[PDB]
Amino acid sequence: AGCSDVSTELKTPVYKTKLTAEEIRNSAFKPEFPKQYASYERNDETTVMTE
Amino acid sequence: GCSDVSTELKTPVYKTKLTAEEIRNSAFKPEFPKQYASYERNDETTVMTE
Amino acid sequence: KLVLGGATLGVVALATVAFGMKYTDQRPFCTSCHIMNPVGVTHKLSGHANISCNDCHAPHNLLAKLPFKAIAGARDVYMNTLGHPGDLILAGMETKEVVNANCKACHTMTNVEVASMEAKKYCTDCHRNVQHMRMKPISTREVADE
Amino acid sequence: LVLGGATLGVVALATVAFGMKYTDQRPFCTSCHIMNPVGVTHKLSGHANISCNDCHAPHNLLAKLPFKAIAGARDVYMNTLGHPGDLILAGMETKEVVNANCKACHTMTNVEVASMEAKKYCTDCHRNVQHMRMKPISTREVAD
Numbered sequence: 001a002g003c004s005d006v007s008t009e010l011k012t013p014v015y016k017t018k019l020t021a022e023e024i025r026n027s028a029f030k031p032e033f034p035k036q037y038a039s040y041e042r043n044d045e046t047t048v049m050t051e
Numbered sequence: 052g053c054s055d056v057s058t059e060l061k062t063p064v065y066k067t068k069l070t071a072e073e074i075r076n077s078a079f080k081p082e083f084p085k086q087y088a089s090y091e092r093n094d095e096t097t098v099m100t101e
Numbered sequence: 102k103l104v105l106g107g108a109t110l111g112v113v114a115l116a117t118v119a120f121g122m123k124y125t126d127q128r129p130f131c132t133s134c135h136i137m138n139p140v141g142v143t144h145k146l147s148g149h150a151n152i153s154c155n156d157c158h159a160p161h162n163l164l165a166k167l168p169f170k171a172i173a174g175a176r177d178v179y180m181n182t183l184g185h186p187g188d189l190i191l192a193g194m195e196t197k198e199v200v201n202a203n204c205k206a207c208h209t210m211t212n213v214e215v216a217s218m219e220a221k222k223y224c225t226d227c228h229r230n231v232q233h234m235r236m237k238p239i240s241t242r243e244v245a246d247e
Numbered sequence: 248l249v250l251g252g253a254t255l256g257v258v259a260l261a262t263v264a265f266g267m268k269y270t271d272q273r274p275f276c277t278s279c280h281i282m283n284p285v286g287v288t289h290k291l292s293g294h295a296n297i298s299c300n301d302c303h304a305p306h307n308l309l310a311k312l313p314f315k316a317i318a319g320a321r322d323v324y325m326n327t328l329g330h331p332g333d334l335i336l337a338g339m340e341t342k343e344v345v346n347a348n349c350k351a352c353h354t355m356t357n358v359e360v361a362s363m364e365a366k367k368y369c370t371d372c373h374r375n376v377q378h379m380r381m382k383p384i385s386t387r388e389v390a391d
């Protein structure tokens with residue numbers, strides 16, 4: 001069902017955005033990283049308290 | 052069926068970033084922090100055997 | 102003549118089954134699912150790297166092993182396709198049990214004179230890192246998906 | 248008719264495989280009284296729950312079949328028509344297949360250390376894995 005061995009390296013995925021070297025506007029990262037952005041937005045929650 | 056011995060025992064071969072005449076202990080620390088930490092145990096000076 | 106062909110098919114059949122049985126025990130087969138990488142890596146890095154996953158994760162007995170392999174197998178395919186796995190992958194009761202039994206299987210002689218079985222429920226309650234190096238920092242075990 | 252043939256085939260290989268394995272374990276090996284000292288010292292040691300040929304034969308299927316028949320044949324001969332000495336010592340060949348099997352199961356312990364270059368064999372340090380040779384005679388051996 002599958003046949004080559006795992007890698008000891010632990011290679012982090014590599015990316016190549018469409019963004020310019022000096023891009024700083026948060027909402028420019030949105031269309032290319034929707035899942036992280038979605039998560040980033042969860043910081044907007046401001047009602048939950050711990051001990 | 053196949054072997055599961057996917058890591059085979061080999062004699063370690065080393066290639067350091069150090070120049071051929073390096074003598075400074077502290078230059079050896081970054082590439083071999085384990086042997087170094089062990090070497091540092093020689094600073095102990097309070098234990099007597101018999 | 103004719104039955105010699107039959108015999109020749111017989112040996113092939115069992116040889117193939119046996120090989121497949123073994124192959125479906127080892128690290129390369131298990132890690133053909135990206136979700137099993139953390140456990141693959143930690144395994145290859147550990148003292149137990151040169152034994153198979155099912156050397157710990159399946160019973161050693163032939164009769165008990167065949168069904169266990171097909172049940173866990175089936176259940177794992179299902180989880181990787183139609184089901185929704187969580188943020189935490191934890192060994193269920195049953196697998197904690199077949200593993201600890203296999204601890205006993207290979208390290209009996211070290212323990213013959215000592216009630217190490219009665220102290221903690223499982224060996225790994227002391228030998229903590231045999232459980233896939235759980236104590237080591239996240240970055241030594243895991244990355245994001247591609 | 249060929250279904251009968253198939254049914255004979257599976258039996259044939261099942262039998263051969265079982266017999267292959269059985270001829271690897273402590274009770275088969277110790278069916279010769281000369282092999283008792285090694286039998287006892289094995290059953291007493293850390294390695295009691297692995298077979299003799301897990302150390303004494305190659306792990307490779309193609310290499311193992313001939314090794315088993317040659318050593319086997321030679322052991323039957325020595326136990327019948329030949330006269331064994333007071334000392335039973337491993338020959339060069341078997342020192343070699345054993346040490347290779349040391350490497351086979353304890354690689355990970357040794358990956359970062361030139362342990363292979365220091366002494367010729369592992370057992371030059373792990374002396375008692377050699378059937379507890381250091382312990383007093385009475386803990387290994389009795390008369391026939």
Ligand code: HEC
Pocket residue numbers: 125126127130131132133134136137154155158173177178180181186187190191192193194195196197
């Ligand atoms: C090779 C033979 C193996 C072994 C020894 C294991 N796996 Fe997997 N597995 C997969 C997924 C998606 C899960 C999560 C299920 C859940 O959410 O509960 C698992 C889980 C496990 C466990 C822990 C749970 C348990 O008790 O069984 C263990 C011990 C385990 N696996 C071992 C996915 C896959 C695969 C995709 C088809 C394959 C192939 C494997 N795993 C292979 C193996």
Ligand code: HEC
Pocket residue numbers: 270271272275276277278279281282299300303318322323325326331332334335336337338341342
């Ligand atoms: C079961 C599979 C085994 C194994 C692993 C070994 N034996 Fe035997 N053996 C027998 C006799 C008479 C001798 C002495 C001959 C002599 O003095 O030269 C031996 C010797 C050995 C050795 C040392 C020789 C070597 O190959 O290095 C070893 C490693 C060994 N044995 C292992 C006789 C028998 C038997 C009677 C027929 C049987 C059965 C076995 N041995 C079984 C095994």
Ligand code: HEC
Pocket residue numbers: 272273276277282285286287289290294297298299300301302303335336337341342345368370376377378
């Ligand atoms: C690995 C852990 C072993 C197992 C399992 C068994 N033996 Fe052994 N054997 C082992 C070593 C390292 C040696 C000596 C190697 C050397 O270079 O001297 C031996 C030797 C023997 C001998 C005779 C030679 C001797 O040193 O006494 C015999 C007859 C023998 N081995 C057979 C044997 C049997 C029958 C075992 C099962 C009961 C067995 N061995 C287990 C390592 C290991």
Ligand code: HEC
Pocket residue numbers: 127128131132137140141142144145149152153154155156157158190191192196197200223225231232233
């Ligand atoms: C030395 C024995 C051993 C081997 C070999 C081994 N594991 Fe594990 N495995 C464990 C232990 C111990 C646990 C945790 C048991 C518990 O929860 O009590 C575990 C748990 C797991 C889990 C989920 C639980 C967790 O803590 O992550 C997965 C998935 C898994 N094993 C798969 C594998 C795969 C795939 C391999 C092969 C690369 C493998 N194992 C090799 C011992 C082993």
Ligand code: HEC
Pocket residue numbers: 207208209210211212292293294297301302345346348349351352353369370373376
């Ligand atoms: C096929 C597997 C296998 C082979 C071959 C093997 N070992 Fe082991 N070894 C094991 C296992 C399994 C244990 C642990 C058993 C236990 O914990 O009681 C072990 C334990 C040990 C130990 C600790 C116990 C002791 O008696 O010192 C040493 C040292 C060791 N092995 C070295 C060796 C050497 C040296 C050889 C070669 C003569 C060898 N091993 C052959 C699998 C093997």
Ligand code: HEC
Pocket residue numbers: 147148149152156157200201203204205206207208224225228230231352353354355356357
């Ligand atoms: C079928 C074989 C097998 C199984 C199953 C097995 N071991 Fe091991 N284990 C070995 C062998 C062989 C070694 C020696 C590794 C080496 O020397 O490279 C070892 C090494 C170890 C070590 C030393 C390295 C370390 O990680 O600390 C511990 C502790 C250990 N085993 C405990 C366990 C526990 C706990 C389990 C159950 C999860 C277990 N073993 C299951 C064969 C096995």
Ligand SMILES: CCCCCCCc1cc(O)c2ccccc2[n+]1[O-]
Pocket residue numbers: 125126155158159167169170171173174175177178
């Ligand atoms: C009909 C038997 C052939 C199918 C082999 C299945 C292989 C298989 C697949 C898994 O996902 C496993 C997960 C945990 C434990 C064992 C596992 N086995 O053996």
Ligand SMILES: CCCCCCCc1cc(O)c2ccccc2[n+]1[O-]
Pocket residue numbers: 266267270271300303304314315316318319320322323
């Ligand atoms: C079914 C064919 C098997 C042939 C019988 C051989 C058994 C046998 C007998 C021995 O005396 C041995 C001595 C040292 C190493 C291996 C040995 N094996 O395998």
